[PDB]
Amino acid sequence: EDYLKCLYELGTNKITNKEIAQLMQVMMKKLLAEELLIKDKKAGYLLTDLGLKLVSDLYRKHRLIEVFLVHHLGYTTEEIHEEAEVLEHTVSDHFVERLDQLLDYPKACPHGGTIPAKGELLVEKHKLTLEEAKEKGDYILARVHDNFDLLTYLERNGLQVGKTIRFLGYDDFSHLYSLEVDGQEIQLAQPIAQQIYVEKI
Amino acid sequence: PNKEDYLKCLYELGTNKITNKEIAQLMQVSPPAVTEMMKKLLAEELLIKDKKAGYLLTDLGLKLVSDLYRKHRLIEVFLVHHLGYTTEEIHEEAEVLEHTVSDHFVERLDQLLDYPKACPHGGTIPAKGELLVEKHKLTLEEAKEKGDYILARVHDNFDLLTYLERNGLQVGKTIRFLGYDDFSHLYSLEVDGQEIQLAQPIAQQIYVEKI
Numbered sequence: 139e140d141y142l143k144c145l146y147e148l149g150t151n152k153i154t155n156k157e158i159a160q161l162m163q164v165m166m167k168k169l170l171a172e173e174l175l176i177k178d179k180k181a182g183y184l185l186t187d188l189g190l191k192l193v194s195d196l197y198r199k200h201r202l203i204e205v206f207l208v209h210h211l212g213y214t215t216e217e218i219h220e221e222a223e224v225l226e227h228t229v230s231d232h233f234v235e236r237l238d239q240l241l242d243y244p245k246a247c248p249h250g251g252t253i254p255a256k257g258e259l260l261v262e263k264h265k266l267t268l269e270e271a272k273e274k275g276d277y278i279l280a281r282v283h284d285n286f287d288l289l290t291y292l293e294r295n296g297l298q299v300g301k302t303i304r305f306l307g308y309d310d311f312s313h314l315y316s317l318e319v320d321g322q323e324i325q326l327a328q329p330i331a332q333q334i335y336v337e338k339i
Numbered sequence: 340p341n342k343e344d345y346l347k348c349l350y351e352l353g354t355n356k357i358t359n360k361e362i363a364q365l366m367q368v369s370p371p372a373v374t375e376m377m378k379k380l381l382a383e384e385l386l387i388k389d390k391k392a393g394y395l396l397t398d399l400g401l402k403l404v405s406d407l408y409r410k411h412r413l414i415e416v417f418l419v420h421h422l423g424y425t426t427e428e429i430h431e432e433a434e435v436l437e438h439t440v441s442d443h444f445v446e447r448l449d450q451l452l453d454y455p456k457a458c459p460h461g462g463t464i465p466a467k468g469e470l471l472v473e474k475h476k477l478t479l480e481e482a483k484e485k486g487d488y489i490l491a492r493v494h495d496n497f498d499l500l501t502y503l504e505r506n507g508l509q510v511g512k513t514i515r516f517l518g519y520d521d522f523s524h525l526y527s528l529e530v531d532g533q534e535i536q537l538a539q540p541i542a543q544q545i546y547v548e549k550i
């Protein structure tokens with residue numbers, strides 16, 4: 139249940155049984171027999187299609203709640219941190235189905251995340267992370283990871299989804315990515331550039 | 340089955356002398372678990388013992404009742420008006436959201452809904468912190484004179500609501516009161532030119548207003 143969510147996140151290298159303890163504190167043969175995952179040597183654990191569905195539903199539930207709460211209840215990043223996951227875990231599929239219709243089938247959450255159709259699989263429109271970029275030109279911040287501290291971080295440093303980012307370059311030894319935002323300069327660590335997606339133009 | 344559900348009970352139960360027995364009945368609970376709750380309600384200062392009325396509600400209990408109803412009615416309005424919920428669908432879902440959503444949610448839902456002054460069942464929706472005062476207090480059973488009547492409010496109660504829809508009684512309909520019977524103990528309604536007999540327990544929950 140709650141673990142699969144984690145297993146899909148680190149999917150975007152290698153998976154350890156020593157890495158499972160750290161992000162969740164303290165399965166497997168259950169996940170294996172409920173056929174949600176299989177074991178890989180190269181990747182450690184890959185989610186079966188039964189998984190990725192079960193999980194692409196969770197992102198749908200989550201991202202729709204997020205749109206509703208942000209667009210229509212006025213919520214701010216702090217408040218979504220407080221309330222969002224409790225009712226996310228309470229609201230029925232029926233609720234989510236009708237919310238989808240009220241909101242007129244939005245394709246993205248406020249943070250740039252794609253909102254998979256029901257019974258369908260999660261395939262993000264924006265996969266181009268900053269870390270993984272090359273050309274030093276003008277870009278567009280196009281998705282951010284859903285997480286609080288990251289959002290806080292960026293909100294503090296004036297980075298907003300949809301805004302225009304001039305990518306200055308990566309320093310090979312420093313380990314610092316340079317940005318030009320609102321006519322000013324910024325230094326982002328790697329782990330913070332690993333969670334932020336761009337698109338050229 | 341928490342303290343809020345007991346207050347709501349007590350609250351409408353006094354729309355007379357409330358007994359620990361009646362509570363235990365209406366709440367479907369242990370007589371030992373009643374005394375336990377009134378101990379808390381008492382101490383939490385939500386009500387005081389009283390000889391004529393059993394328990395009276397303190398302004399604090401009153402304000403708490405006003406929230407319960409705000410929350411319940413606003414959710415209701417949102418579910419049906421915005422999400423096309425059905426009487427049945429609300430019976431299965433409305434309650435668990437009330438036990439769950441914050442008060443910010445409710446304060447914002449209210450803004451979204453453009454501050455509706457009534458849930459769809461006639462039940463009025465108080466401002467935040469305003470004491471609850473139903474617009475429609477005139478129940479069918481205390482309806483004196485015969486004639487033409489707008490059916491203005493009904494209780495949410497899913498059993499009662501099923502009953503109403505299963506007889507084409509809907510809020511905002513014009514209702515013809517043919518009148519109480521003295522021995523029959525029956526209320527006669529012409530509704531859509533069709534006669535209908537209501538018992539005392541159901542007349543008690545329909546609210547009307549003479550048009």
Ligand SMILES: [Zn+2]
Nearest residue numbers: 247249251284
């Ligand atoms: Zn998101």
Ligand SMILES: [Zn+2]
Nearest residue numbers: 458460462495
């Ligand atoms: Zn209602």
